[PDB]
Amino acid sequence: ASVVPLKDRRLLEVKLGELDFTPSGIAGAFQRGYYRYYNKYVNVKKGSVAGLSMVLAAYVVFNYCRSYKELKHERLRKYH
Amino acid sequence: NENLFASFIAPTMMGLPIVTLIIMFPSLLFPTPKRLINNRTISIQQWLIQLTSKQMMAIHNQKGQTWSLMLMSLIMFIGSTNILGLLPHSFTPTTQLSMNLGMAIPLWSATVFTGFRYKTKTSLAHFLPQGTPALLIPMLVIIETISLFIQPVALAVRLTANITAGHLLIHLIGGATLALLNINTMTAFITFTILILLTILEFAVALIQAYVFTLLVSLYLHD
Amino acid sequence: DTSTWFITITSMIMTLFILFQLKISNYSYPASPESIELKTQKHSTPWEMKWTKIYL
Amino acid sequence: PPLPEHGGKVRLGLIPEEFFQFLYPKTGVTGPYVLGTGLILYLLSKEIYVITAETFSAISTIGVLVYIVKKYGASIGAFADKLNEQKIAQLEEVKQASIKQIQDA
């Protein structure tokens, strides 16, 4: 399973931003990564936001799971 | 009696979940390329080192420059692990006081044993400052040695105590927004206080200059 | 909070300083490159005098 | 203070004009949008589950990271500029070594 998780980061990193393979990241898949937010993080050209801001968005929702048991707070219903 | 603030009483929890994943994670944010031209996201990491490798190099100018290639690894770790934690529900390893007492003492005592393996006399004959007057020899060498052993405690406790102090004002000013179901005008001003305070809490980069540098001065002075 | 007992993190910090000394060790330096800028010239410069003595 | 008041009034008018323009743009695109309304429910169902807490400081640490995307479009120029000297720093050695030798031969 080690060659399974190692081929997740390697494949993802090349595809997400940058690597005949180095200039493939020069156009970048940042145009593919762009459409998720709205438009506004446009500065990803050489300081690439959507390359980095996906890992940090993954590390937040991964740490939302551990905190969920402690801060329950929910009634016998749903919120607004 | 117009604007009544509220408060909420709730325990503020520095729990201890599984740490050895969380330590390794700000290593994989930085890649390293085996190529000549790089790919415009390492290239602004590679430039950022070039700068601050030219300020912990300039002072020393010795054959103690061999030590300085490590000191730029020390600045990227607590430069990152203090900047990751500003996110919504993340966890900083430099919050707990445990590892910082393992970052000070194996580094601080690596300095006093550096001159004692080469100089052996004049490293702690730096306790002799000047052309000795008579009435203040015992008042001096009980002072300048009590301000030596303070230095490992002075180096670690200054880091843990203000990093966590940033996190409580994040919660308490933030938690007073949630419990502000009274008059709704003052809710924005507490929110606007937060988004100023989060700009001040990017002095978590500024507090790593004051950890590598007073390690250099505590290296340059001894050696 | 006031946490306790300390058998944790500190053994997981020195494994990290096998990582950071692996990445940052492979760093191209402009200054280092500059220091390889004059090593090619003056070997060929005296090589011009190597044919000046081989003739004269 | 009077000068500050005038500027604020001017700023307030321009913002309203911009808002009107944005509204017109939103109105035009009414037929052809099939993206957001597929995923606006999971953020409406999970927000009916658990996601409310003392995390209005979640937005303000994400709001400040939007203002740095403004200067990131100037960080690109710096990034582009970075190593231009380095690559040129490499162009000087390939140019000097050939021309200094071929005339000597």
Add this chain to the structure above:
Amino acid sequence: QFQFTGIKKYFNSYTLTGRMNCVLATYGGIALLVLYFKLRSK
């Protein structure tokens, strides 16, 4: 095991003084004991 010979020239250079975690180790062992001692007397 090639996380060694890339940095093996570095180690025996500076671990002569840098690999003195014995003091750190000694402090850690003592710290664990005092915590246990206070929880023994509760």
Add this chain to the structure above:
Amino acid sequence: IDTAAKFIGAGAATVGVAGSGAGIGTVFGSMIIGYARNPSLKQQLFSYAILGFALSEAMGLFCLMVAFLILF
């Protein structure tokens, strides 16, 4: 009985920060008169404003460290 002594020992511990509320007031007032003489702010003059700020807030916040320990 010590419930008040929980409070005032915390309530007296907080006023030791009142030095560093003024100590950074020196180093920012003393920078503008170091700047109006010599307009080279991008040099090391501004870099000695933050290290002077950080070394003063290092002795600033950890006075509130002893405040919470008396509470909690």
Add this chain to the structure above:
Amino acid sequence: IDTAAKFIGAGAATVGVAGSGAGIGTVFGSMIIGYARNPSLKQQLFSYAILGFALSEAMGLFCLMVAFLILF
């Protein structure tokens, strides 16, 4: 004993928030001696004061929440 303990932890904390008034005496005051040497006014000169004025007040409004943290 409850309202006795709360209030004298609250008043003795608000001493520290006028402990940063003595800093902005220097921050707003040392603008004077800088402005008279050089009148480059709307430069970073007045704006470095705002980096002094609102950072020294940021230790002033620091402890004021901590006083109201022990009001309740």
Add this chain to the structure above:
Amino acid sequence: IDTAAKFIGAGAATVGVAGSGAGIGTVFGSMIIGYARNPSLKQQLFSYAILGFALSEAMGLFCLMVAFLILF
């Protein structure tokens, strides 16, 4: 009653750092102006501020050591 007077006993002795908490603001606000006038910091003019900081932050944690030794 031994415990409660200790709780206020360390609370008064917390504020001994409040002298060093702003005494480190002055000396690092006096090398912003001594480097501005004469740029020769790399000699004595920086090592006289750290030597100013060592012999003034010797007295900040000097008093909190007493506030610990009155607590335990």
Add this chain to the structure above:
Amino acid sequence: IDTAAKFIGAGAATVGVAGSGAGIGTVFGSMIIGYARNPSLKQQLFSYAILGFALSEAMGLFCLMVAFLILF
């Protein structure tokens, strides 16, 4: 209750060493601003700081020795 006043008495008596905290932050900062204008330190310039350090220190450790002699 007799030892209860023995502990809170040295609690405020070591606040008098904070006066040698902020009072030493000037006289080590004044050897910064007044060194660059005149490089003659090996003459009585450094010697009038050591007198200025020690005799300012003597009122620091004197208010430490009260806290010992009040307790024992």
